[PDB]
Design a protein around this nucleic acid. Structure first.
Lengths: 423, 150, 96
DNA sequence: CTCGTGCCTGGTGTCTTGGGTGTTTTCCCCTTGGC
DNA sequence: GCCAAGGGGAAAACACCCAAGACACCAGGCACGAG
């Protein structure tokens, strides 16, 4: 065998990225000239503990474990080259290319083993895959869930940026496996904020808002979306007629493309008593710097008031609120129907908005004319007609005689053109 | 008189590491789908790792400024919602890969045969295809069993 | 099955020729006093008046739930949602 | 004195919206025609 | 030849039905409360 063996098709995995290199096995150790960095990585036989031969992206790879706790993965070896590699391996490293087979059964259940830096996830004793823990750049915990976010190593290819593990609570031991597991990961890891459990009416579901510097990553139970703050046309705070909830609206332009369907709005529903606590993973100087002392790095209080303030900053849009419109029933909106559904029509101080699906907004400037037709509740009830300057017509049906006068007083106060005003 | 019995099988992608494919995407650090084996092959931190489509619950994708994020959600405790089969898994106390999220830039990088995001966009699309086909063949067996040959 | 839970609850359906008030009398009586107080002070409430209100309201709310169930059923829904109460009230025209 | 009210958990099941039909209506392409 | 009117075709806007799934409700259980 040669005293050293050289190859050019092998690679090495580091911090969420694979890296090719000119591997040079020697009597002294493995010397690898990484071509992405040009660096020569030399690991001596004395630093090593184990060698493994198994599948990777470019076919098969060589896994090397050091006494240092650092665990190195190598790729690009063809499974057919085994003899050339292992013969030299056994001769100088007194080690062999062991069969720690990847579990190709394709299951998601397994076992997590902290084999130093290389965390192994194994179906029984066959690792499905293993991650060098040093690759974790940010980390968070939730009930029965471990979040691993790798370094945003933009120099990588199709890169596994996030992996999450679901950890069933242990039956034999009362100690929390998430904290225990989370700290064990963190004992090798390399680690803005999340408004957790947000009740969205649009899109429908419960999402966790992972705030980011220029966008909010609305993390969901299957889908997720990032909304660049630049796209928000407006922010609205609409008090629910129940006097117990509030609808927070975010006009989106562009609309998020929910599969084929698209939303020109983001609608949130929160109760007036739905308190929460928020922590910014930012320095207080930065918090003061961006928020003029109107807020603090740590706060607690009603989610609606708090969220309205937090997002008002990230997007700068002012919180839009209804004018002095408060119906005969006192609500700042009117019971109505638009299309094949019912929702709330809000007489804003400078426009009209139909709350909940299909969500629609109107500005007094877009109105051509409107009218209070003889409605559907009583012979003196009303239905409200709207036609836009765009020729697009909207009409809100079925509204009590009681709300006729208030909207009658309101539109005259907004001085908009009513079809029957010439009567 | 007496009660009724049932049986179940495991979702094995490949019998051994040698039977698993060697398709170009795998080499190319690309998320791949092996339709013949109802299996998705993905580069898990440089490791070509298979996942039988039967483990994937559903998928999602997001464009995050300069990047395209493909998110793969898998069946696991608490995620396998609605089914009375809570803890579907042959070993529910095992830890589970809840989900996998890959990102690739929306912009074609130098020398590529396909945009980084193009692999995600095709894997995303093809997963829904193979998944629905599998769900459908599965649904057949549920509706098919319990019928007397006329 | 002769065991408890079976016998009493089973037979209670037949023992229940009684017309037990479904809202707790004192918890309710306090609310009566409270709303009464909300209206005016010095209001002595005869237990008879408290009963009169309690029984009427329970049947009345059950009545409201009859309509609400219909309306849920109407919408092809089992779970009633406040919109049903509202629908029912609107249709009954029993609104302030 | 102890039954009733309540905080907490898991599950469902059941309400929501996405995907889709085909009906009532408009804007557009195609072509002939009149000054 | 330049300039214009008409029938028709493909499509859009709507009221409605069918499918999926997630949350939010009841069911289950241990504990505090005040009838």
């Amino acid at each position: 065998m040669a005293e050293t063996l050289e190859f050019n098709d092998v690679y090495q995995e580091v911090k969420g990225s694979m890296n090719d290199g000119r591997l040079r096995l020697s009597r002294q150790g493995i010397i690898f000239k990484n071509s992405k960095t040009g660096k020569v990585d030399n690991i001596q036989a004395g630093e090593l503990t184990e060698g493994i031969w198994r599948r990777v992206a470019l076919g098969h790879g060589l896994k090397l474990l050091t006494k240092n706790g650092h665990v190195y993965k190598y790729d690009g070896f063809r499974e057919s080259e085994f003899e050339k590699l292992s013969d030299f391996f056994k001769t100088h490293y007194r080690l062999e290319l062991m069969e720690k087979d990847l579990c190709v059964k394709g299951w998601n259940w397994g076992t997590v083993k902290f084999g130093g830096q290389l965390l192994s996830f194994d179906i029984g004793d066959q690792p499905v895959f293993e991650i060098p823990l040093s690759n974790v750049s940010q980390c968070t915990t939730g009930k029965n869930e471990v979040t691993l976010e790798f370094h945003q190593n933009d120099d990588a290819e199709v890169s596994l940026m996030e992996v999450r593990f679901y950890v069933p609570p242990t039956q034999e031991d009362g100690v929390d496996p998430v904290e225990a597991f989370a700290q064990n990961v963190l004992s090798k890891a390399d680690v803005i904020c999340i408004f957790r459990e947000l009740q969205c009416l649009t899109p429908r579901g419960r999402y966790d808002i992972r705030i980011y510097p220029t966008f909010l990553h609305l993390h969901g139970k299957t889908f997720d979306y990032k909304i660049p703050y630049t796209t928000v046309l407006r922010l609205f705070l609409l008090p629910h007629k129940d006097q117990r909830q509030m609808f927070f609206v975010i006009s989106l332009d562009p609309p998020i493309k929910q599969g084929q369907t698209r939303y020109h709005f983001l609608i949130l529903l929160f109760s007036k008593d739905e308190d929460i606590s928020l922590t910014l993973n930012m320095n207080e100087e930065e918090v003061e710097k961006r928020f003029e002392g109107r807020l603090t790095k740590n706060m607690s209080g009603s989610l609606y008031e708090m969220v309205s303030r937090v997002m008002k900053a990230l997007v700068n849009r002012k919180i839009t609120v209804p004018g002095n419109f408060q119906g005969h029933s006192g609500a700042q909106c009117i019971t109505c129907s638009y299309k094949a559904s019912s929702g709330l029509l809000y007489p804003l101080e400078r426009g009209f908005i139909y709350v909940h699906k299909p969500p629609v907004h109107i500005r007094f400037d877009e109105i051509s004319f409107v009218n209070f037709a003889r409605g559907t509740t009583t012979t003196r009830s009303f239905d409200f007609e709207i036609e836009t300057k765009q020729g697009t017509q909207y009409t809100f049906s079925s509204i009590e005689r009681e709300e006729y006068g208030k909207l009658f007083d309101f539109v005259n106060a907004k001085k908009l053109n009513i079809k029957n005003r010439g009567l | 008189e007496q009660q009724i019995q049932k049986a179940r099988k495991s979702n094995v992608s490949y019998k051994n590491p040698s039977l698993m494919p060697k398709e170009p995407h795998i080499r190319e650090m690309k998320i791949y789908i092996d339709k013949k084996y109802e299996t998705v092959i993905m580069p898990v931190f440089g490791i070509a790792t298979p996942f039988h489509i039967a483990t994937i619950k559903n998928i999602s994708m997001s464009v995050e400024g300069d990047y395209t994020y493909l998110r793969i959600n898998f069946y696991c405790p608490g995620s396998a919602l609605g089914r009375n089969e809570g803890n579907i898994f042959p070993n529910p106390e095992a830890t589970f890969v809840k989900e996998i999220t890959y990102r690739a830039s929306n912009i074609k990088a130098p020398g590529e045969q396909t945009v980084p995001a193009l692999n995600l966009q095709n894997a995303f699309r093809i997963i829904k295809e193979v998944q629905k086909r599998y769900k459908t063949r599965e649904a057949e067996e549920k509706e098919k069993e319990g019928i007397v040959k006329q | 099955r002769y065991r408890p839970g079976t016998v009493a609850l089973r037979e209670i359906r037949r023992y229940q020729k009684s017309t037990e008030l479904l809202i707790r009398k004192l918890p309710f009586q306090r609310l009566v006093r409270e709303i009464a107080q909300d209206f005016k002070t010095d209001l002595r409430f005869q237990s008879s008046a408290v009963m009169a209100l309690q029984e009427a309201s329970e049947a009345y709310l059950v009545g409201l739930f009859e309509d609400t169930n219909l309306a849920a059923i109407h919408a092809k829904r089992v779970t009633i949602m406040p919109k049903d109460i509202q629908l029912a009230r609107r249709i009954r025209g029993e609104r302030a």
